[PDB]
Design a protein around this ligand. Sequence first.
Ligand code: ZN
Lengths: 75, 177, 98, 100, 42, 49, 38, 161
Amino acid sequence: EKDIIKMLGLEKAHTPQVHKNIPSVNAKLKVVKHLIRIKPLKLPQGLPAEENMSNTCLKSTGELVVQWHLKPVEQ
Amino acid sequence: SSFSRAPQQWATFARIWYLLDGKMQPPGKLAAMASIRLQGLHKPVYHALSDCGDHVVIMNTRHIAFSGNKWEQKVYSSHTGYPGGFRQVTAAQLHLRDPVAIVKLAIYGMLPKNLHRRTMMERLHLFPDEYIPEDILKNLVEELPQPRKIPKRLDEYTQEEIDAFPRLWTPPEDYRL
Amino acid sequence: MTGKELFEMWKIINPMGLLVEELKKRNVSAPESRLTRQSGGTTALPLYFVGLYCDKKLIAEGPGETVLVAEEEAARVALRKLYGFTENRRPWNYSKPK
Amino acid sequence: TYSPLPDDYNCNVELALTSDGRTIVCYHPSVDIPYEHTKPIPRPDHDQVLKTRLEEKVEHLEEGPMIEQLSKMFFTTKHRWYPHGRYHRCRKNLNPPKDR
Amino acid sequence: GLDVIRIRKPFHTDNPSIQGQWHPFTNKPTTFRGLRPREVQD
Amino acid sequence: VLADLAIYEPKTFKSLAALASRRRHEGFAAALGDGKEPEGIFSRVVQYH
Amino acid sequence: FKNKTVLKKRCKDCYLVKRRGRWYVYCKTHPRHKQRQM
Amino acid sequence: SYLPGYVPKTSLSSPPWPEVVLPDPVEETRHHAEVVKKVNEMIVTGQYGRLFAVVHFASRQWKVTSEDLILIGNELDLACGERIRLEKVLLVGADNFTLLGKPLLGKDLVRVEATVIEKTESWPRIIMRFRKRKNFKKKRIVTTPQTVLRINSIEIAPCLL
RNA sequence: GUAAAUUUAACUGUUAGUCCAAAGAGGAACAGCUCUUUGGACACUAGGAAAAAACCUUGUAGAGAGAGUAAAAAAUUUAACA
Ligand SMILES: [Zn+2]
């Protein structure tokens, strides 16, 4: 179980990591499924582009926004 | 408060005399509220290194109420140090011999186990009855509310409340009762 | 004179007597001293809060170990408020003049 | 007539919100003690020929009774009233730093 | 130029209180005629 | 900050206590309802994007 | 009085009674049927 | 005259806490505007004295007022004497009025400015580790950089409405 | 998915181990008992089980008078009777 954690890049705790939903990767997850929290990655704005790399932010809900404005909603 | 430096310091670190009525009250709940006042835990300026404790006056310590069978089951044990000097008395036996021992022991067991515990016991005053010396009575400030609300006896209910409460059953007329 | 009180730099004698004169200039009736808070009066560590009342209106409240000391300090509190040298006053403006 | 806390002892707290809801306004004017809740200060406290000259009343008391009298008037224990040795009296900082 | 020694507090203010430093009577309501608990007047 | 406010700013701390008490009462009212009633005035949350 | 963990009546005259915190078996006809809960 | 959900008054019939009725939101909404306008009217006329502001700086919340000192345990890369503005203010309070940010106040409502007056290293701190019977003993001395800021002024603007 | 592995060169040092979980032996379906196997911890830090090498939480190292969390507080009152 320790080796699989290193292979998945989960050394530091409470550090989100993005992996592909494929059977080979899922095979490793099913071994350490009791040591990790699995959430889907949602894209309300879609895949980040080249111009949106510097404005990404992964919220706690699992959604990755491409426009992190740090500004209260006017609505 | 635009006070001078010395009067401002004196007022903040002043001692306030509080009053407690122990009639029909559990000793522990009396001790819990007396513990914080004696240690000064009720003040935002509280600190262990600062002697910020206050004076607690508890009256009617003879008429305390023990929940359950604590009058018969609870045992206060002490040892005189000599062989065969192990004495064990119940709460009822101790209460008759000393009306203020039960409250004093409950409060003493709640203070921190340090050298300051004996200092805080000097600022605690116990009186078995409602009689209080004038000097202690003339410097009281606030009467802390009783923790436990005394239930009313059946004879203390007025006719308005008795008639307000509905009867749930109709007894037969031929029942001797 | 930042962390210094008004009377800490201006040493005076009998602040109560000077308070009466400043109220006469403003057509204010003589203040009445009454006890608002009291604790440990019979003990060696008392606390008195003497409150100055003009026309049954509180103008200052001061603490003290004894009644005379508390009354004397309460007079200083009233003088600070009248002169505007309270601790609540806005700090000195050191910004560049406009 | 709703009030989260009784406006009787400390101040009259009036909660409010801004139009955008990005700032909470708290208007808390100080309350004054009513004139009817105070007590007046106790201002009040023969054929004599010889003037009453001040007479010293410092009665000699042993170390025991002196500490017992002090422990009762200040409601403390006898332990703090005993002196300490030179070693502890020399470790004490006679010029401590002062703040405010 | 001050000595490089331990500093007791990371802050220093000459007027720490603006609404009045806390005193035990700050949060205690006043009673009619300021009577003490279980005290009878006249 | 709250410890400093409770000592040097008693009036400000009472305002925070009133706000916390008001918010505490709003949650109890919302817990009694089934969501039909609108949320409390102080229960609104400013969203950041 | 014989201490028994389980109290059993030994005749029709034995009757159970709750006294002083423990059940007792009394039998006036047969005084040897008296038992005390252990 | 008893409803199907009626319970006679007993000890546990009703909750021990007294019932609390919240104000009508429609009626209370305009009541808030009256309080805000009064407090906003206290700012244009300058009916306030010293102001204490709670600012978030160096991952720390400081209860600062005017003309006071604060020690910061890191270097700001700023020459001494430079005047800067502390952007994050969470609370501004006065003798009679208090404003709360959610969680921060707008830059158009409060302005706090400080000055770099002294940049110095900390006093030597002893970092020593020891384990018995293992010949494990090593001593390290560190001097973390420090910075002292003095709050010059705390001013607000009438932008509540 | 990851970044190690093998070979080459040069030698030192450790191997009188413990306890916990699990499978199975010897003893008495005893032992802080003995003897193998798998795994963990311990001889590496800290928090929690009262004090605590072996249980649980948790590791990569500094300063802070900031913050969010992990494990983490024993329950129970029992006999009538045709
Ligand atoms: Zn029988």
